[PDB]
Structure formats: C-alpha cells, structure tokens
C-alpha cells in the first residue's frame, strides 16, 4: 500500500559530458512537476534544467560529477529521494 520510492534504471546513452542530454527512465518518478520539488544528477544540482514529462521520463542535463558512481537521485513530495541501480558515465568536455 505505502507509495514505493521512485525507482531508477534505465539511460538511452551511456557515455557523454555532463551538459549530454539524457532520457531518465524508471517508476514512480513523481505522479506531477511540482511532487519535482528535488532533483539532483552526480550530486550535482539540475532541477532548473530538469523537466516534468511523466511517472518515469525526466529531461535533464547530468550534473557535474561530485560523488564517485554517478546515481540519478530524484526527490518526491509524495516519496523521497529516488535510488538508480544503473550510473551515468561522464565524459571530460571537448576541447
């Protein structure tokens, strides 16, 4: 019965700078924009950059990296903190 945390695990690409665009994939990730209230990427904040879409798909830019794995976090008015199995892999920038 208790609202299950958004779940993470899923990534279109897999390799890509932090200003790369990419899909977020998962469950429960906030049933509204405004449940977004939070929303951090490799410990870096984005939510200025991230975009409501669904119960699952997020756009937004990785942040620069500040942890060590790379988990895509996803706070929740209704739930929490979101936990990702799966770690995207920034790339240094171009140049």
Same mark, same amino acid.
């Given at each position: 019965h208790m609202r299950q945390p958004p779940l993470v695990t899923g990534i279109s690409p897999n390799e890509g700078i932090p200003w790369t665009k990419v899909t977020i994939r998962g469950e429960n990730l906030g049933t509204g924009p405004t449940? *977004? $209230? %939070? *929303?951090? $990427?490799? %410990?870096?904040?984005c939510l200025l950059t991230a975009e409501w879409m669904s119960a699952s798909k997020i756009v937004c830019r990785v942040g620069q990296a500040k942890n060590d794995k790379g988990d895509i976090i996803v706070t929740t008015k209704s739930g929490g903190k979101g936990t990702s199995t799966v770690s995207f892999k920034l790339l240094k920038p171009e140049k």
């Open positions: 449940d *977004l $209230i %939070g *929303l951090t $990427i490799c %410990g870096h904040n």
